[PDB]
Amino acid sequence: KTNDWLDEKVRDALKPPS
Amino acid sequence: TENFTTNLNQLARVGGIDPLIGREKELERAIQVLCRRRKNNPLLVGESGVGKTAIAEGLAWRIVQGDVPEVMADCTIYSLDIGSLLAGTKYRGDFEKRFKALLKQLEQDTNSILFIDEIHTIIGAGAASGGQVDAANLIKPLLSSGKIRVIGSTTYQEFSNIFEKDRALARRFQKIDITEPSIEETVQIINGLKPKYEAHHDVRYTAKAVRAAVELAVKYINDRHLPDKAIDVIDEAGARARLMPVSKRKKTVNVADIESVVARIARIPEKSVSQSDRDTLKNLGDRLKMLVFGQDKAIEALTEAIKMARAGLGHEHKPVGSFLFAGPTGVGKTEVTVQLSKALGIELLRFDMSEYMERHTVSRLIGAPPGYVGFDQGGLLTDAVIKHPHAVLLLDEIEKAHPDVFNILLQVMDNGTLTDNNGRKADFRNVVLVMTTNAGVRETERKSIGLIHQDNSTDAMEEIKKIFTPEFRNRLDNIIWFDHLSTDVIHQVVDKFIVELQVQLDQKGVSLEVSQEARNWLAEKGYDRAMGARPMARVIQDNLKKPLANELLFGSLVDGGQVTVALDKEKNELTYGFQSA
Ligand SMILES: Nc1ncnc2c1ncn2[C@@H]1O[C@H](COP(=O)(O)OP(=O)(O)OP(O)(O)=S)[C@@H](O)[C@H]1O
Ligand SMILES: Nc1ncnc2c1ncn2[C@@H]1O[C@H](COP(=O)(O)OP(=O)(O)OP(O)(O)=S)[C@@H](O)[C@H]1O
Ligand SMILES: [Mg+2]
Numbered sequence: 001k002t003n004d005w006l007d008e009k010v011r012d013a014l015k016p017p018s
Numbered sequence: 019t020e021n022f023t024t025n026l027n028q029l030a031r032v033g034g035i036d037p038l039i040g041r042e043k044e045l046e047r048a049i050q051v052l053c054r055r056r057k058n059n060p061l062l063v064g065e066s067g068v069g070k071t072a073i074a075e076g077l078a079w080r081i082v083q084g085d086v087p088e089v090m091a092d093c094t095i096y097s098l099d100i101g102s103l104l105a106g107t108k109y110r111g112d113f114e115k116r117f118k119a120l121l122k123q124l125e126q127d128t129n130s131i132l133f134i135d136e137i138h139t140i141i142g143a144g145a146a147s148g149g150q151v152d153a154a155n156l157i158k159p160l161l162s163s164g165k166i167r168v169i170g171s172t173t174y175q176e177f178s179n180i181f182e183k184d185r186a187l188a189r190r191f192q193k194i195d196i197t198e199p200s201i202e203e204t205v206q207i208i209n210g211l212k213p214k215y216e217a218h219h220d221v222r223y224t225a226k227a228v229r230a231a232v233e234l235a236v237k238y239i240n241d242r243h244l245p246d247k248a249i250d251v252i253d254e255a256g257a258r259a260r261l262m263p264v265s266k267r268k269k270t271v272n273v274a275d276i277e278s279v280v281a282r283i284a285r286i287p288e289k290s291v292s293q294s295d296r297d298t299l300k301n302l303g304d305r306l307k308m309l310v311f312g313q314d315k316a317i318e319a320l321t322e323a324i325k326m327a328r329a330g331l332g333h334e335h336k337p338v339g340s341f342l343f344a345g346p347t348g349v350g351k352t353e354v355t356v357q358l359s360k361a362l363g364i365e366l367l368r369f370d371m372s373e374y375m376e377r378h379t380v381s382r383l384i385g386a387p388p389g390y391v392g393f394d395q396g397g398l399l400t401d402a403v404i405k406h407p408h409a410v411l412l413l414d415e416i417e418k419a420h421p422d423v424f425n426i427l428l429q430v431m432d433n434g435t436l437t438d439n440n441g442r443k444a445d446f447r448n449v450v451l452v453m454t455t456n457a458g459v460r461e462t463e464r465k466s467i468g469l470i471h472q473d474n475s476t477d478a479m480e481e482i483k484k485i486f487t488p489e490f491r492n493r494l495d496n497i498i499w500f501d502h503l504s505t506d507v508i509h510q511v512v513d514k515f516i517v518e519l520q521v522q523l524d525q526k527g528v529s530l531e532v533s534q535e536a537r538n539w540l541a542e543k544g545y546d547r548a549m550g551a552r553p554m555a556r557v558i559q560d561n562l563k564k565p566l567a568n569e570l571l572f573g574s575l576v577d578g579g580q581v582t583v584a585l586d587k588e589k590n591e592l593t594y595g596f597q598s599a
């Protein structure tokens with residue numbers, strides 16, 4: 001009767017003011 | 019607006035857009051939906067390769083051509099190029115000026131419509147710090163107002179996962195389902211598109227050839243949808259006919275050419291048999307017999323089944339062969355399967371089944387469910403079959419595998435394809451499935467009580483029946499019970515092993531000559547019906563390899579040796595004579 005046990009950061013772009 | 023979007027109406031006038039054939043229900047729905055309010059903007063959600071872009075772009079071509087309602091006759095169509103808008107958005111407010119300016123032109127005209135292909139992309143398109151603006155938000159008020167109507171197209175997966183998330187856009191848009199057309203409808207489309215492809219390649223396609231492409235491609239190519247799949251053969255067929263002869267002797271595309279093109283695209287060996295390949299097929303049984311002695315029934319079953327597939331008398335959606343090999347220990351069950359791959363020059367997909375004893379291990383064959391550590395690696399069986407469509411799948415020791423393993427094979431034998439965690443389907447039509455089993459092998463070596471031993475072959479079959487479900491046996495093409503090696507067969511086995519030893523000695527520059535009397539002596543010492551051919555190898559190791567090893571390492575056989583072997587009749591013992599030479 002055994003049982004088997006199964007087992008954010010992104011770059012951004014900047015826009016300078018026109 | 020000149021660079022941000024392209025005028026599809028103008029493009030059709032110059033012939034850019036291809037002719038639109040078929041899909042009369044989609045065009046009718048799109049036109050009627052556009053004129054009415056209450057989700058005036060139509061959507062074209064359909065699977066890939068189903069001509070979604072052809073319906074939106076083909077509408078502009080139809081409008082300029084004619085045979086359209088008066089209200090839509092003057093309605094110009096444009097296509098949004100998202101890349102162009104973001105090409106120069108270096109500074110703040112560039113996107114606002116471009117998007118607002120474009121909307122003003124479309125909205126003020128009141129008869130201009132923007133067709134945004136892959137509309138899922140516009141939901142985002144901006145995340146720069148400070149602006150907090152998106153293309154969908156810029157057009158959201160206009161769509162809610164209803165002054166501007168816009169067509170769109172998206173994949174079914176993207177619509178449910180991306181477009182559906184934005185309830186505002188999904189609520190406004192009116193979904194129009196698009197699905198693969200019928201076989202008859204697809205060939206008609208090719209005929210409509212035949213002038214374009216024929217002009218570029220300077221080729222002509224026969225009526226039978228276009229029909230063959232749809233039937234052959236759908237039969238062998240499954241991943242792609244019917245419209246692009248069938249057209250892919252026509253385009254490649256024209257290129258092959260145009261490029262194959264330098265003299266351009268053959269311009270027309272014959273039906274035979276279409277078959278060859280489909281074969282390469284689907285990587286199926288089925289094609290007209292070549293003279294070189296035909297010869298090898300004829301002698302497959304003879305060559306297999308030379309390497310594997312006895313077991314003629316097994317070789318005949320494999321050779322005949324393979325011959326049928328090339329001839330075309332093969333199962334439509336099943337593997338060429340599903341043979342279960344059960345026999346005594348030491349018989350050549352694995353060897354015939356392994357040698358078959360070498361003789362046919364195909365890869366051997368050998369999958370030991372002892373490792374899959376546990377139930378949870380079966381997922382490894384079809385891939386781990388998404389979201390786990392091992393999902394990325396994928397299934398080992400499906401990936402291997404995809405990489406090698408024509409190959410021998412040797413599932414040795416299938417008895418040891420968990421019952422769940424047999425369930426997966428049941429689908430492969432009848433359906434002909436297995437879906438992995440990713441969802442890709444592997445084609446087993448050209449795979450030769452040979453599963454070796456040692457079920458009921460203890461009975462084979464069991465010595466029955468009584469003066470005369472009894473044949474326990476029947477008892478072994480009963481054990482196989484107990485272990486394998488009746489449905490499993492029904493699916494198998496044939497179950498071959500390998501017979502025990504006879505004395506005559508063992509004599510050939512001894513010679514085969516000596517040949518292997520000779521080859522090894524040749525690397526070291528030594529030549530071995532074994533007399534006929536010596537070979538008979540070796541056979542009698544090691545011939546055991548129950549144990550099989552394996553004891554013969556052990557006898558060769560002790561009697562022949564061990565003396566040679568000492569001489570090879572330290573002795574006359576170190577360099578350029580010679581060897582002679584004879585049987586001492588008086589002493590009934592072999593004599594090993596080594597010459598330094
Ligand atoms: N109903 C049709 N009438 C005429 N030509 C068609 C038709 N359906 C498809 N075709 C042709 O086959 C091509 C199929 O590819 P496209 O329609 O361009 O693909 P798509 O719809 O943009 O693809 P995805 O994968 O859905 S983004 C079309 O561009 C036409 O050349
Ligand atoms: N019928 C045969 N003809 C020639 N060589 C054979 C034959 N049977 C076995 N051999 C030899 O034995 C080896 C091959 O054994 P395999 O066929 O792999 O055994 P097997 O069928 O997997 O064994 P079990 O005990 O049934 S799991 C090679 O050295 C072959 O040369
Ligand atoms: Mg498209």
Ligand SMILES: [Mg+2]
Pocket residue numbers: 351352414415454
């Ligand atoms: Mg075996």
